[PDB]
Design an enzyme around this catalytic site. Sequence first.
Site, PDB file in Angstrom:
ATOM      1  CD  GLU A  59      -2.219   1.814   2.524  1.00  0.00           C
ATOM      2  OE1 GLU A  59      -1.315   2.466   3.082  1.00  0.00           O
ATOM      3  OE2 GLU A  59      -3.353   1.662   3.031  1.00  0.00           O
ATOM      4  CG  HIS A  60       3.629   2.503   2.987  1.00  0.00           C
ATOM      5  ND1 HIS A  60       4.360   3.392   3.744  1.00  0.00           N
ATOM      6  CD2 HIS A  60       2.542   2.181   3.728  1.00  0.00           C
ATOM      7  CE1 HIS A  60       3.741   3.599   4.893  1.00  0.00           C
ATOM      8  NE2 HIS A  60       2.636   2.877   4.908  1.00  0.00           N
ATOM      9  CD  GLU A 136       2.848   5.311   7.812  1.00  0.00           C
ATOM     10  OE1 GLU A 136       2.692   4.115   7.479  1.00  0.00           O
ATOM     11  OE2 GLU A 136       2.399   6.272   7.142  1.00  0.00           O
TER      12      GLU A 136
END
Lengths: 443, 81
Positions: A59-60, A136
């Site tokens: 997703e990154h 994160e």
Amino acid sequence: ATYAQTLQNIPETNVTTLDNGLRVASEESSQPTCTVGVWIGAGSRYENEKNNGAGYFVEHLAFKGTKKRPCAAFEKEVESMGAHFNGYTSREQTAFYIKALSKDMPKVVELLADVVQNCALEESQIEKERGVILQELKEMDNDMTNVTFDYLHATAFQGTALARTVEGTTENIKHLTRADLASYIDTHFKAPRMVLAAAGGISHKELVDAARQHFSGVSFTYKEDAVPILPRCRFTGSEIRARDDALPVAHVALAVEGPGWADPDNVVLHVANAIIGRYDRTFGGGKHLSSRLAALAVEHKLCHSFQTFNTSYSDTGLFGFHFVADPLSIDDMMFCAQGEWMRLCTSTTESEVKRAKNHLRSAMVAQLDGTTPVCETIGSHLLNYGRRISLEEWDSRISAVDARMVRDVCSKYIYDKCPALAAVGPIEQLLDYNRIRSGMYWI
Amino acid sequence: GIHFGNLARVRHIITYSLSPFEQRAIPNIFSDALPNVWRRFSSQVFKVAPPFLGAYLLYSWGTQEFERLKRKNPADYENDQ
């Protein structure tokens, strides 16, 4: 124009399947602006001990460039057209979508396909995001609400796949290979498991056309077009208590196993949750709120906030509530919260459901407030129900619900069940499991 | 009277438990329970038993001695006529 009429006059949702197995659906409106994206039936639940946090790692990179167009090029092109590129990855569902001018629906579709199919997975970008993701995880570690829900899954589904978090482990993130991410993508981002959804001012046939042009790569074998059924995740009545009296407030989450997407009872559970509702210290309503629990919270200052939920999944789910309270009011809060759950199963009123039903309707209508939210519904719906469900159908189902029905369904999933509990923070006042377990009967 | 909530200042301790219905009431009797009963017994027998053993002896003696002194001493009538 009556509520009914408006529900019937809503443009229908068109669906068409390509030979490769991909499904293209969209709802047409007269908006110069639109949202289109691909909803993949993938997520942490599909990962295992070795590749947990891969779908997230991916997703990154899904936005750092493709083969046809490196990073800067990819970004500039999207930025310069005023389009918005967002997306997310969860436990059973992933998504990459773009908000743009209907006038660009086709170029977008090309972009989407390029992202899901030809991600550059730049060897150097990978090591770079490896550090970003690690930051994160520390940021999210301070998000009690999310730490609490992770823990809730960690114990409620201990030993299984839903126990894992979406972001993954520290060891995985520190050692995931360019090959692992690649493997992830090839294994999961596959036509039959994806859904091209779009909403706004777009031609279904133009959408499906660009779709045919860019979402090609058909499969040969049978193993490539079959959607794998995941192994069941066992629910466990249990608790995880993470104590830290240094934290200012305490978070508590209690839940029973839910039915799973396809089950009709979900309409009833959502009505039920509507009766108990939710609350937080800024609800002007105050001591006059219809939700009894909310009223008591105000009168006795039981919590800072509380919320019910009915999280679904393919074959299971979590039906429960979560609250935030001062170390010294946890016990009374839990007392009243469980009390209300007992009331549901035992003494629900027609008035109660009448209100909850209205509340639920306006809530479903609110989740279709814009092109992105509507697009999300389509993606999710086909991916979970294998078909879109109109507001008119929902309303049809919601209308059939009555007090007796709420009681039986609630009694069914709640009464005398062994819950899953997650408590974080200054939780000394929260009584033991046995005491809580007793709050599960009589009421 | 009311104490839960103001007892101790605790930090960074996680605990995990299961409902009583997900588990066995008396599990691992042979692999764990008894082996431990033996452990416990063993680690205390030479602490407890000894003094009681001694009490028992003193009892045995003192009892036997009492009865012995009730018996007749033949050497009290040897030269009686």
